[PDB]
Amino acid sequence: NNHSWLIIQADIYFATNQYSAALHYYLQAGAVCSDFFNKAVPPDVYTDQVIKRMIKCCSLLNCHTQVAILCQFLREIDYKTAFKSLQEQNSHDAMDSYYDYIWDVTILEYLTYLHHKRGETDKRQIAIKAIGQTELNASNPEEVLQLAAQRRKKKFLQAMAKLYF
Amino acid sequence: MPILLFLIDTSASMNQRSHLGTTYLDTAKGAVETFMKLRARDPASRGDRYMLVTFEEPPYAIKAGWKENHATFMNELKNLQAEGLTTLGQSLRTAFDLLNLNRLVTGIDNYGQGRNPFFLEPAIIITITDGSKLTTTSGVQDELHLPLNSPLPGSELTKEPFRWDQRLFALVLRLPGTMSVESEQLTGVPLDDSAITPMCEVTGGRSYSVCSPRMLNQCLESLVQKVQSGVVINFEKAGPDPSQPWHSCHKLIYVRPNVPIGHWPVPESFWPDQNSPTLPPRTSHPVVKFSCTDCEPMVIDKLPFDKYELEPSPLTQFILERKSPQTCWQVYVSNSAKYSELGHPFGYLKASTALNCVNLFVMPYNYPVLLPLLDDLFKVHKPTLKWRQSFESYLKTMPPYYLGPLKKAVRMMGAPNLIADSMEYGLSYSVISYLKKLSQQAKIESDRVIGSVGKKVVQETGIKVRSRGFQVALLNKDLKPQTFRNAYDIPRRNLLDHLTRMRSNLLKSQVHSVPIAQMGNYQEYLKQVPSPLRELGMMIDEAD
Numbered sequence: 001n002n003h004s005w006l007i008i009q010a011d012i013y014f015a016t017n018q019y020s021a022a023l024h025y026y027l028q029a030g031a032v033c034s035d036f037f038n039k040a041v042p043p044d045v046y047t048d049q050v051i052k053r054m055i056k057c058c059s060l061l062n063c064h065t066q067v068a069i070l071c072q073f074l075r076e077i078d079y080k081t082a083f084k085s086l087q088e089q090n091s092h093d094a095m096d097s098y099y100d101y102i103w104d105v106t107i108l109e110y111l112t113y114l115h116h117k118r119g120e121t122d123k124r125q126i127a128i129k130a131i132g133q134t135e136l137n138a139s140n141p142e143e144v145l146q147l148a149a150q151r152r153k154k155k156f157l158q159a160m161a162k163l164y165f
Numbered sequence: 166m167p168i169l170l171f172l173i174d175t176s177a178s179m180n181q182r183s184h185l186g187t188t189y190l191d192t193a194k195g196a197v198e199t200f201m202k203l204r205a206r207d208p209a210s211r212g213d214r215y216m217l218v219t220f221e222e223p224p225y226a227i228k229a230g231w232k233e234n235h236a237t238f239m240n241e242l243k244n245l246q247a248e249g250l251t252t253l254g255q256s257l258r259t260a261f262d263l264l265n266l267n268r269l270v271t272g273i274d275n276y277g278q279g280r281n282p283f284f285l286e287p288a289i290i291i292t293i294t295d296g297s298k299l300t301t302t303s304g305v306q307d308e309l310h311l312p313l314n315s316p317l318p319g320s321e322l323t324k325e326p327f328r329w330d331q332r333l334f335a336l337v338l339r340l341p342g343t344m345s346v347e348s349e350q351l352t353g354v355p356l357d358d359s360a361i362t363p364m365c366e367v368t369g370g371r372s373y374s375v376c377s378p379r380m381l382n383q384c385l386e387s388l389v390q391k392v393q394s395g396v397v398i399n400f401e402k403a404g405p406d407p408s409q410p411w412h413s414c415h416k417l418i419y420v421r422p423n424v425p426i427g428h429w430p431v432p433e434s435f436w437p438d439q440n441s442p443t444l445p446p447r448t449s450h451p452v453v454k455f456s457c458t459d460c461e462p463m464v465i466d467k468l469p470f471d472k473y474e475l476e477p478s479p480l481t482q483f484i485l486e487r488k489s490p491q492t493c494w495q496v497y498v499s500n501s502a503k504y505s506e507l508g509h510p511f512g513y514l515k516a517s518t519a520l521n522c523v524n525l526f527v528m529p530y531n532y533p534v535l536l537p538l539l540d541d542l543f544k545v546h547k548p549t550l551k552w553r554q555s556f557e558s559y560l561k562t563m564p565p566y567y568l569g570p571l572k573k574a575v576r577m578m579g580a581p582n583l584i585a586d587s588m589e590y591g592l593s594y595s596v597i598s599y600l601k602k603l604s605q606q607a608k609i610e611s612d613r614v615i616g617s618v619g620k621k622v623v624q625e626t627g628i629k630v631r632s633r634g635f636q637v638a639l640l641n642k643d644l645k646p647q648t649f650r651n652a653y654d655i656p657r658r659n660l661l662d663h664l665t666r667m668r669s670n671l672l673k674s675q676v677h678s679v680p681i682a683q684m685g686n687y688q689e690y691l692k693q694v695p696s697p698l699r700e701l702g703m704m705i706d707e708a709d
């Protein structure tokens with residue numbers, strides 16, 4: 001339960017290109033810090049470097065919507081890699097089941113554009129239904145927006161813990 | 166002859182629900198409905214053409230261009246779908262391209278012959294969007310940039326896509342998901358802080374940070390009050406008055422008709438010459454530098470003076486604060502003299518004695534050295550040779566484009582045989598040939614765009630199956646099923662009953678799916694029916 005050493009093990013696996021194992025230990029460190037993601041993970045543990053490493057681990061495993069979810073963990077939301085990852089079609093993750101963990105309206109706008117351009121209308125309807133949510137309104141009061149982001153963050157990281165532990 | 170172009174944001178971020186339960190696109194369409202409801206109240210607004218542009222791809226972006234009836238505009242507005250990205254810059258470029266498409270063929274934009282406030286094609290672009298960041302396939306652009314990849318012919322002569330008589334307004338819908346009103350909405354409409362605000366400001370318009378339905382109604386009402394004919398002027402301050410907001414102001418100067426009339430163009434920002442293969446690019450808003458100095462508004466008889474009432478602006482606020490109704494402030498333009506760069510005073514801003522309005526009075530290029538001279542000629546009655554050499558001396562300090570209107574005016578006073586009757590145009594033949602080429606190309610591309618607005622092209626219905634060519638079709642509604650002519654359209658569960666039906670139908674012995682618009686039409690139904698023998702709270706409930 002030493003998150004510093006868990007991050008060290010995750011990075012050791014990350015350098016050797018064991019991306020599944022690296023993700024395992026990053027999520028283990030996060031679950032040490034926040035009590036199984038019940039609280040916010042401290043920024044001095046899930047730093048932008050750690051989150052970027054997690055992004056690379058998810059991308060190299062073809063879990064592209066998971067890359068899109070992790071892209072809004074960063075202090076400055078990285079839309080370039082998020083949009084690049086969502087363009088991929090060889091996904092090995094649940095895809096449309098993860099659209100409930102996206103709280104950024106820009107990511108969902110791009111998802112709706114992508115599913116409309118590529119012709120999948122039902123997934124496009126799922127993304128539109130996700131945008132058309134009261135708690136998702138970008139013009140909401142701030143404390144509502146962090147609460148939506150925090151609950152989606154908790155659910156997403158717990159789902160990843162279930163998948164990767 | 167106004168034009169009302171609506172740049173409806175159709176990015177998928179417009180699918181955000183407000184507390185009303187309707188998406189931002191639904192309130193956007195409703196705001197368009199409210200706008201035409203309010204605009205139609207003015208009985209001088211009867212003659213008015215609406216256009217529609219969206220954020221889609223260029224063939225599909227325009228949905229109501231020129232020569233499209235109001236019914237098509239309504240039908241296209243009702244059926245919009247928010248499914249694209251926030252390509253706001255590209256949509257603004259195509260919106261301005263739509264408006265400035267016909268400018269060259271009819272020559273409203275007089276290039277090198279002066280800027281004519283009386284030659285204008287008024288229009289305003291209302292872009293209803295949200296505050297969401299701009300998006301392209303690459304990423305988030307985070308700043309409004311207007312693409313310049315495929316310039317329209319003649320776009321190099323204006324240097325800015327937006328024209329003299331075009332203004333941009335924005336309805337940035339900030340309606341929150343949860344009901345969060347307060348007394349803060351009771352105050353006036355705020356400005357926005359998004360990327361559409363600076364481009365709105367430089368066009369002479371403004372944005373509207375709307376956050377509530379009542380302030381949406383206020384914003385729409387103010388927008389109806391701002392649909393006015395005229396041209397915008399980038400007023401600049403020169404010299405000290407006896408930071409300030411009058412130092413730089415884009416304000417509207419209204420144009421009144423009775424086909425508006427007028428004679429004196431605003432001077433160009435270059436000295437014309439006959440040895441320039443290419444014309445300089447004039448700015449969209451002609452900078453005028455007013456000298457903060459008291460001056461007399463002297464007026465003479467039988468000569469064209471053009472009055473242009475200003476929009477209520479901080480310039481007018483300054484004028485009323487320093488209430489000096491019987492004096493005037495001189496205005497001039499830089500780069501309008503061969504022997505000087507400061508130019509010469511061609512007009513003056515004189516406050517009305519009642520202090521109701523401030524009006525621009527455009528005169529010939531150097532009016533204090535023509536008006537006494539011409540008034541002397543008209544009061545001294547033959548002309549004198551001293552007057553002739555003085556007239557020639559004026560022509561040395563005079564750009565060529567004023568000569569035509571001055572000769573026209575002098576003809577109107579009743580002395581066509583005066584010295585200015587020689588006539589010319591003072592511009593390069595290369596420029597004139599380039600202008601005819603621009604007119605031809607503008608006409609051809611105008612025809613091409615007007616044809617493309619109807620959208621005779623269509624989208625495919627494939628998936629392009631990969632090999633991790635062949636494609637699986639998508640469902641297409643209103644594809645006209647041929648069930649009675651094609652057995653493949655018959656569902657298996659509905660096979661026997663359909664078989665019985667079309668068996669009976671083939672013998673001696675789908676329908677009722679009319680569109681809802683033509684469903685309660687009793688005028689149309691009775692028109693297609695024979696006549697009988699002749700005799701001896703809410704808004705509507707049908708059949709009046």
Ligand SMILES: [Mn+2]
Pocket residue numbers: 706707708
């Ligand atoms: Mn009825």
